[PDB]
Design a protein around this ligand. Structure first.
Ligand SMILES: Nc1ncnc2c1ncn2[C@@H]1O[C@H](COP(=O)(O)OP(=O)(O)O)[C@@H](O)[C@H]1O
Ligand SMILES: Nc1ncnc2c1ncn2[C@@H]1O[C@H](COP(=O)(O)OP(=O)(O)O)[C@@H](O)[C@H]1O
Lengths: 743, 130
C-alpha cells in the first residue's frame, strides 16, 4: 500500500502546504497547485496543496502543527493521502473566532485579519478545521462552521464571507467521538473481546468479506441492568473501528406525532444505508417493542411490524450492523429472535470487585488524590453497584471535599479556579461518608463471580477434596481421554451430613480451584417459588447457569421442600412436587457439551424424594464427617488470621479438648473471644476518659492507648460459654444410612 | 479585612437585633446595646442593636428577615459591620403605611400599632427602611 505515510516536521510555516518528494510525486501523478484529501485518525479529513521538496524523505511528509491538531495526530503516526481533483469552488462561508482569542480586541475581524490572509490565497477549507491567524500582537484562532458547497470549497475573489457572531467555545462538548476508546472500559474483558472478535471483520475489511461469500451478522443484543455501560460499549467499538455511529432513542421515536413515528425510523434506516459501514444503535428496545399480549392499542403493533419489515429488508444492501439494548431478555417480543433478525445475545453483567476497582481507578483521573487512598477496600465494600453509581460517588466525594474546605469568604473573582482542584485532595472520611450516603441499585440480582475461598481456608478432609477434584477437574482438563475411551462423566454430587460441617466452603473452594463462575440458590428462595412462579424462576436460573458456562450451580437446603411439606398444613405438596419436577425436567434436558456442574447439599437425607437419586441425575453420595484432631487445628488456624492476633499461644489443646464440635462452635468461640477483648478495651478507654475529666491536664502528652492484648485469660473466659451445636443421635442415624448405602 | 461577615439565619425575631459571637466583640471592642452601622449591596443602609449569642460562629452573623430585606441582600452574602457611636435622640418621625397591607382597617393606627411597638424600645431607625 503506497498510501501509508509517516509524518514529519515541515520547513515552511504556511497552513495549507505539505512538502512531497519527487519519486512519490511522479508515482501518484500530482501537479503544482492541485488539491488532495488527507485522512487521519478519529475520522478527520483535510484538504491541502501539494508542494515539491527534495529534502523530505519518501516515507516522511512535511506538515505543520495546525494540520496535525486538525487531524488529531502526532509525530510518528501514519496518515493516508488521496488525490482530490473534484474540488468545487465555494460561494459563501461562515467563520467564527474561538472563545479564548478575542479577549479585549473589540474590532472588525474582516479587515484586520481576514482580508490580508484571504487575498489571492486560494486556500481550501473543510468543516472542523482549526487554523491560526498571525497579525499585530495576537494569534487569532478561527472556526469555519458553514460553507457552500459543503464540505469542500475554495476561497475566491468572487466569494462572500461573514464573521458576525459570538466567540464559539474550544470544541463545545464534542469529546465522545474523540474519547471513549478501549481505555475507558473496565471490568468487561470477556464481553468486549467477544464483540471485537465478531464485529471487526465486517467493519474493517468489507471487500474481502464480500469476496468470500459468507453471511455477516445482522443483529446483536446487549442486555443487562441499566447504567452498566452498554451504549458506551457501542460508542467505543464504533469510534475505534471507524464507522458512522447513528443513535436512535426509544421514547423520542415513540411520541413524535400520532402516526408519523415510523416515517422517522424509516428515514434513519435510509440515511444509514447510504453512508458507508455504519452502526445503528436502538436504545430501550422494550419501550417500543414489548410483548404482543401486553400491547393494548394499535399504533404499537404498527410500529413493531414496521421495525420487523425494515429489519428483514437488510438483505445484502451494505455493511450495516444493528445493535440493540434491553433490560430483561424475556421482555422483548419473541418474534424478534428469528434467524436473520437479532440472533446473537451478549450479556453485560454487574461488575465484580476487580471490575469495581478498575472503574474507580478510571474515573479518579482528573482528581488529585492524597497519599492515603487505598481503593481496594473502598471497592470491596460496595457490593451492589454499577458504573453510574461509582461515577456519582466520585462526584459527591469531590463536592464533599469542597464542603470540608469551602471558599472561605473567598470573593468569587474567577481568580480561584485552577488552585481549586490544584490545592485539594480526598481522604478516607469523604469516601466513607459517600458510601454511607449512597443508594445501591443492584441489590436483588443473582451474582455470577469466581469465589475467593481456597483449599487452605477449609481444614483436613483430604479424601473428599480428592474425590471432588477427581469428578470435576479431570473431565474438563483431559476430555480427550474420556471421548476416546467412551464414557459419560457424572453430572451431580449430593452432600449429606450433620449441619455446620462446611459444605458451602467446599463448594466455593472447588469453584475457585476450577476457576469457574458460582451461582447460589438458597433455601428461602426455593421455598418462596412454590406459590405460583414455579416455572419461570427455574427457567431463567437454569438458562443463566447455562449461558455463563462454566459454572457450579449450588442448591442449598434441598430437604426444606419436604420439611415444609410435612406438618399441620399439607397444602404445599402440589407446590413441592411442581418445583421438584421443574428441577428434574430441566436437569434431564442438560447436554454434556456445556460444562455445567450441579451440586446439592442437605442435612436430612432420609426424606429426599427417591426420584432424584437415579443415574443421569444427582447420583454420587459423599458423606461429610465431623472434624477431628488435625481438622480442628486447621480450622482454628484458618479462623485465626485477623489483624490483631498478637503472638498468642498454642491451639493444639483447644482442638484436643472439644469432641463433638462442628465449625459453627469454633467460629462462635472465636467471635466470643474478640467480643470480650473489645469490651475490655472499651471499658479501659472509658476509665481513661473519666480520669482525664477528674484530673485536667493530667495526660497532656499523648500516652499510648491499650494495645490489642488478646490474652489467654480473655480467651479462657470467653470460650467458657462453650455450646454443643449438634446432638449425638443424629450421628448414629447418618452412619446407619451410610452403612445402608454400602452393600 | 476582619470587618466583613457573612449573613445567616437568626433565632431572635425582633426587628432590631443581631447576633455576634463573643470573640468578634473582643476583636472589635463591641459592647452590648451599642448602635452599629450596616452596609450592604445596592448602596443600602440600616442600623441595628448588637446582642450576645454564642451559637453563631465567629465568622458568621445572624440576622432576621426584615433587616435582611432592608439591606437588599440574601443569605450567604457579605456585609460590613462597624460601631456607630455618633447617633443621638431623634426629634420627629414621619411614617406612612403601605397600600397593600391596610386594605380594610380604617382606624387609629397610631394607638393600635405604633404605640406598643415603639414603647420603651429605643429602636434606632434610618430613613427609607421598611
Ligand atoms: N467501564 C465502565 N463500565 C460501566 N460503566 C461505565 C464505565 N465507565 C463509565 N461508565 C458510566 O456509564 C455511563 C454511560 O452509560 P449509560 O448511558 O448509563 O448506559 P445505559 O444507557 O445503557 O445505562 C457514564 O456516565 C459513565 O459514568
Ligand atoms: N474445614 C472446615 N471444617 C469445619 N468448619 C469450617 C471449615 N471451614 C470453615 N468452617 C467454618 O464452618 C462454617 C461453615 O458454615 P456453612 O458451611 O455455611 O454451614 P453448612 O455446613 O450447614 O453449609 C463457616 O462459618 C466456617 O467459618
Amino acid at each position: 500500500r503506497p498510501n501509508r505515510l509517516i509524518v514529519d516536521e515541515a520547513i515552511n510555516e504556511d497552513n495549507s502546504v505539505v512538502s512531497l518528494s519527487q519519486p512519490k510525486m511522479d508515482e501518484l501523478q500530482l501537479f503544482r497547485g492541485d488539491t488532495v484529501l488527507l485522512k487521519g485518525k478519529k475520522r478527520r479529513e483535510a484538504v491541502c496543496i501539494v508542494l515539491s521538496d527534495d529534502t523530505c524523505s519518501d516515507e516522511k511528509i512535511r506538515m505543520n502543527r495546525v494540520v496535525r491538531n486538525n487531524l488529531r495526530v502526532r509525530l510518528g503516526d501514519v496518515i493516508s493521502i488521496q488525490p482530490c481533483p473534484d474540488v468545487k469552488y465555494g460561494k459563501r462561508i461562515h467563520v467564527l473566532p474561538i472563545d479564548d482569542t478575542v479577549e479585549g480586541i473589540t474590532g472588525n475581524l474582516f479587515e484586520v485579519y481576514l482580508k490580508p490572509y484571504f487575498l489571492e490565497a486560494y486556500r481550501p477549507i473543510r468543516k472542523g478545521d482549526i487554523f491560526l491567524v498571525r497579525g499585530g500582537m495576537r494569534a487569532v484562532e478561527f472556526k469555519v462552521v458553514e460553507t457552500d458547497p459543503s464540505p469542500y470549497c475554495i476561497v475566491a475573489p468572487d466569494t462572500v464571507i461573514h464573521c458576525e457572531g459570538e466567540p464559539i467555545k474550544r470544541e463545545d462538548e464534542e469529546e465522545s467521538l474523540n474519547e471513549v476508546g478501549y481505555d475507558d472500559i473496565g471490568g468487561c474483558r470477556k464481553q468486549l473481546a467477544q464483540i471485537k472478535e465478531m464485529v471487526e471483520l465486517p467493519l474493517r475489511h468489507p471487500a474481502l468479506f464480500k469476496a468470500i461469500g459468507v453471511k455477516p451478522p445482522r443483529g446483536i443484543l446487549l442486555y443487562g441492568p441499566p447504567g452498566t455501560g452498554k451504549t458506551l460499549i457501542a460508542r467505543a467499538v464504533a469510534n475505534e473501528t471507524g464507522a458512522f455511529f447513528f443513535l436512535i432513542n426509544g421514547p423520542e421515536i415513540m411520541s413524535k406525532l400520532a402516526g408519523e413515528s415510523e416515517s422517522n425510523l424509516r428515514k434513519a434506516f435510509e440515511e444509514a444505508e447510504k453512508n458507508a459501514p455504519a452502526i445503528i444503535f436502538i436504545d430501550e428496545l422494550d419501550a417500543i417493542a414489548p410483548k404482543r399480549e401486553k400491547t393494548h392499542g394499535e399504533v404499537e403493533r404498527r410500529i413493531v411490524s414496521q421495525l420487523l419489515t425494515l429489519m428483514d429488508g437488510l438483505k445484502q444492501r451494505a455493511h450495516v450492523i444493528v445493535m440493540a439494548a434491553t433490560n430483561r431478555p424475556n421482555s422483548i417480543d419473541p418474534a424478534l429472535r428469528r434467524f436473520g433478525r437479532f440472533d446473537r445475545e451478549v450479556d453485560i453483567g454487574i461488575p465484580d470487585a476487580t471490575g469495581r476497582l478498575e472503574i474507580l481507578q478510571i474515573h479518579t483521573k482528573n482528581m488529585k488524590l492524597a497519599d492515603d487512598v487505598d481503593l481496594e477496600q473502598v471497592a470491596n465494600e460496595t457490593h451492589g453497584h454499577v458504573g453510574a453509581d461509582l461515577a456519582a460517588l466520585c462526584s459527591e466525594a469531590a463536592l464533599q471535599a469542597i464542603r470540608k474546605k469551602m471558599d472561605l469568604i473567598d470573593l468569587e473573582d474567577e481568580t480561584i479556579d485552577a488552585e481549586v482542584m490544584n490545592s485539594l485532595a480526598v481522604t478516607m472520611d469523604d469516601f466513607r461518608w459517600a458510601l454511607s450516603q449512597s443508594n445501591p441499585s443492584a441489590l436483588r440480582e443473582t451474582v455470577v463471580e469466581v469465589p475467593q475461598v481456597t483449599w487452605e481456608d477449609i481444614g483436613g478432609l483430604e479424601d473428599v477434596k480428592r474425590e471432588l477434584q477427581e469428578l470435576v477437574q479431570y473431565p474438563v482438563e483431559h476430555p480427550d481421554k474420556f471421548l476416546k475411551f467412551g464414557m459419560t462423566p457424572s453430572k451431580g454430587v449430593l452432600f449429606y451430613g450433620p449441619p455446620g460441617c462446611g459444605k458451602t466452603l467446599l463448594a466455593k473452594a472447588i469453584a475457585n480451584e476450577c476457576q469457574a463462575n458460582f451461582i447460589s440458590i438458597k433455601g428461602p428462595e426455593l421455598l418462596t417459588m412454590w406459590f405460583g412462579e414455579s416455572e419461570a424462576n427455574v427457567r431463567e436460573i437454569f438458562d443463566k447457569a447455562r449461558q455463563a458456562a462454566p459454572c457450579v450451580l449450588f442448591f442449598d437446603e434441598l430437604d426444606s421442600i419436604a420439611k415444609a411439606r410435612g406438618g399441620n398444613i399439607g397444602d404445599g405438596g402440589g407446590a413441592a412436587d411442581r418445583v421438584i419436577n421443574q428441577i428434574l425436567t430441566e436437569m434431564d434436558g442438560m447436554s454434556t457439551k456445556k460444562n455445567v456442574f450441579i451440586i446439592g447439599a442437605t442435612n436430612r437425607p432420609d426424606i429426599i424424594d427417591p426420584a432424584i437419586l437415579r443415574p443421569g441425575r444427582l447420583d454420587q453420595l459423599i458423606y461429610i464427617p465431623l472434624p477431628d484432631e488435625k481438622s480442628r487445628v486447621a480450622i482454628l488456624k484458618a479462623n485465626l488470621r485477623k489483624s490483631p492476633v498478637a503472638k498468642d499461644v498454642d491451639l493444639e489443646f483447644l482442638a484436643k479438648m472439644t469432641n463433638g464440635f462442628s465449625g459453627a462452635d469454633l467460629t462462635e468461640i472465636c467471635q466470643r473471644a474478640c467480643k470480650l477483648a473489645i469490651r475490655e478495651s472499651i471499658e479501659s478507654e472509658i476509665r481513661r476518659e473519666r480520669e482525664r475529666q477528674t484530673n485536667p491536664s493530667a495526660m497532656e502528652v499523648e500516652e499510648d492507648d491499650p494495645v490489642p492484648e488478646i490474652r489467654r485469660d480473655h480467651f479462657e473466659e470467653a470460650m467458657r460459654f462453650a455450646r454443643r451445636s449438634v446432638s449425638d443421635n443424629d450421628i448414629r442415624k447418618y452412619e446407619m444410612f451410610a452403612q445402608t448405602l454400602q452393600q
